[PDB]
Amino acid sequence: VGQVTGLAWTEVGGDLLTIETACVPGKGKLTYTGSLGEVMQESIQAALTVVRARAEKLGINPDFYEKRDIHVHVPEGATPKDGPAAGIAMCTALVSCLTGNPVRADVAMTGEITLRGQVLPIGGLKEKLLAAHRGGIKTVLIPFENKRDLEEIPDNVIADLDIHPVKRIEEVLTLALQNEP
Amino acid sequence: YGRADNENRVGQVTGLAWTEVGGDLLTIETACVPGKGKLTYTGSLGEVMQESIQAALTVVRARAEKLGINPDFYEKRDIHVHVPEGATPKDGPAAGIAMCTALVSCLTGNPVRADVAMTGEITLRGQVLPIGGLKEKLLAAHRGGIKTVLIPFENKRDLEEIPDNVIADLDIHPVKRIEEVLTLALQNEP
Amino acid sequence: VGQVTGLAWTEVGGDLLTIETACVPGKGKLTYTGSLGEVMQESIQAALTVVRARAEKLGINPDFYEKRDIHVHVPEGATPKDGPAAGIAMCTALVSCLTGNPVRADVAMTGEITLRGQVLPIGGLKEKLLAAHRGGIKTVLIPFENKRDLEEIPDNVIADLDIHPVKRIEEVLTLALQN
């Protein structure tokens, strides 16, 4: 619940990230921490807007923005992270936490989100899937246009991962959340 | 999962503007969701491009009653303007009319025409100013399969330089003012 | 939306500008854009303060700003601008804007404004007036102390132009507002 394995860029160490999101009694503030670069901070804003746009249909109270504060933290806190690859992870974690819909266990996702809910292709796919296997992720959700980059990946890697090329965020919410979103 | 709700709250217009790697097609997304009058803008946007967004929103706010929008709309709403792709640096004023069009579309629920792209600097007075790098821009729209391009009236001189087959392919409309831009690009009449 | 042709310093192109001012329903915010240097940003503040101090006399309710937002823009948006010389153009635009009393479109103006409504001299009167000339401007308002500078300006530019030297903002508004 509000905890998603995303695959995004890091300055050092694995391109696998745990995204945590908390919704606590507040005034409507948005905090985001974890040594996050601007492009990544912007992806959180984009993902939160997607959620705000769909709130009624997502079973969220559309006026949650006023009586709750949301903190998005990505450990390890001192490791620099950046890029837009965690966007769909950001959205899923927010939907989970605002709803209480637990995220599925062995699932990771990579992909850039747009405000309309399309999933955009990302970079360094090969290194991302490598952090997926070496973190023991069974299912990896990827952007449809990144299918081109699947042919460059070792057979050992792919064989163990269940990779789902996805086009839209509604596919992501279905494949990642435990319950009906 | 609100895909429909997502559609009616996020405007979407294809713009021709400057990016780190040259003038290019951009999708300008503008969301208007429940809020308190805030404005967010994201997309690795330079400062000139951030100022064009504020200019475009001011055009809508000033003309809200005339576009069938509540003048007190901004009191109960937040607005997020996002320009993909998120890690690509973009700057400049050439997406101004696309930004204006996106806000009008979203706030009036008047969908934007498919095969239309636009380039132009907007002013608070509603006039469209000429932009630079038209060739590159039109070349992008052509390769992307756009049929109709709105350009600023004073960029007519710049069409001589465009390859003939690209000009022949494109339905190019020199516009002087925003009213023309909105009429040509939206599905309904504002 | 107020609209006044100013003559002010720019990094590229002519020293001619359009000052735009909007005043929409809001919360009392001021926004200013136009690739503005800080000196020019401060001149927008000084200009708005002049109008706000003279709200009642100008036919404006002094509590107008309570429930409205103001945006000052200076196209062309990508052109770096700076200096205090668009001060009276900004004051005029705001006055025009808050009153809905249009500005004469055949007028341009240059000058630094003070909180007391005084118009102070500016630099590069020549570059500015050449620009007003190349731009088809018929009438040009300049500061009073700038009269001694018109000697260094081309006789043909002086001949084409209707130059009115001014001391205060009330002269500017009389000459610039159509009503």
Next chain:
Amino acid sequence: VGQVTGLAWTEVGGDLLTIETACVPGKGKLTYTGSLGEVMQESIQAALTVVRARAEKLGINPDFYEKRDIHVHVPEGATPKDGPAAGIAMCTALVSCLTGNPVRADVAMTGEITLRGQVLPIGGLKEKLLAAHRGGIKTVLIPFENKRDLEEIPDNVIADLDIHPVKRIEEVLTLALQNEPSGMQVVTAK
């Protein structure tokens, strides 16, 4: 009302300042413009605090103050100015706009202000007094601890200037303002 001549530091031209203050309707905001360095800005914030702390005595209603905005401007706006030396001038001008008590025109002043209302010595008095001499200023207030430095100033410059060494801000206000700023005027007879 809201116009005091100060003597402080400027990058170019004279060390003389024409300080302007407007008190227009507002929500209690303070603006300070005129290309002012940080020390000078901080000197403006100390001057306003002084006014606020003595509001009842200066007969300023805190309720009136909170429904007003204040703008301190020091033209010419493009000239860099800095230092604490305009503090008593700022405090004078601020009392002025807030009370509509105009400042005597032949009067300039130099000195650092303290929250306690005391007037601290400044530097470059020779420069400052040379400035006011060039402006036909006849009355120049200076901090009492600066009297020592009057000696090294040309007796020609001294003569033409009516110099009042001052110890507190309360003296400053009574000297440079038109009416009596603090308190009720009572008449006694022997």
Next chain:
Amino acid sequence: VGQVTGLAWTEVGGDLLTIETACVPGKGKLTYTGSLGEVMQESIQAALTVVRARAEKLGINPDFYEKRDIHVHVPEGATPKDGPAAGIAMCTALVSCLTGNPVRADVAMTGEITLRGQVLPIGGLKEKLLAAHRGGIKTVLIPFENKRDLEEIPDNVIADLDIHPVKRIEEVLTLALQNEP
């Protein structure tokens, strides 16, 4: 109450840090001072959200932050500090403060906190435990994954210490709080 010895990175290396927290009347603000670097400041934010998400459980009024301000200060004022290692100490200090549950005097602690309450390993454990030894610290709490780092710290130093490898914040608070929460 409102005070915890943490071991965290400072200019002169890992050292004995006194984390202080205050809670006073206000309107929901958060102040942090002590020449703190940004990662260390971000750790304070994560520590607070932990407490805010768990208020009722800790016996804190869920809406405590409504009419109250929080100041977290790390003396000595002039000494630059940074890193995520003081995070379980911030959280403990906040819990102590908001509950009036005194922190034990014999306990120093080091560890990165995540919003979910896990304690992540830190670096420079040697310097930190060598500082707790010189300051008369009996009991030291360290992250569970830091256990193998003990092997690089002089045995005469470790033998003198009551070392507790912890995994979750609930362990940290039980061991560190004078009373039983």
Next chain:
Amino acid sequence: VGQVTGLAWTEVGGDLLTIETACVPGKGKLTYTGSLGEVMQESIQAALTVVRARAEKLGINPDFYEKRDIHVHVPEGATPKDGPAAGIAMCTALVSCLTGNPVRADVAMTGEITLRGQVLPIGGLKEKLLAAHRGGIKTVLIPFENKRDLEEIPDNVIADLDIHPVKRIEEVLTLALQNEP
């Protein structure tokens, strides 16, 4: 009232400081001027929190802040000052102006304050004391652990001064304030 002589570092050196505070009708803003470095700024924020924490005990209306503004100013405005050694001086000036308890003019004071009200040791004690001596200060309050530092100072200087080594801010307030706090 609201004036305290403190001893701290200035660009010329550890010198004599006249610390002013003002409390006027406002909305809860703190302003601090005097060409202060950020360590000095943080000392003010800590000192104010100390006063806010102990508000009711001091006679102060605990809601005082949401209704008033505070300006702390340290002339001379153009002279750069920094560090934490004016902390207890900040705290006293703040207690002074908020309570209307005039400070004794003849007392200087130096020492880093903590959120707990404890007085921490400072540096350049000699320079600080040479100031107070030539400043005509009769009584000087110094941190308790700074007693050792008295021996690197001329005996003629120290013999002229009534030095009070303090441990806590409550000691500071009784010695420096005119009346019962």
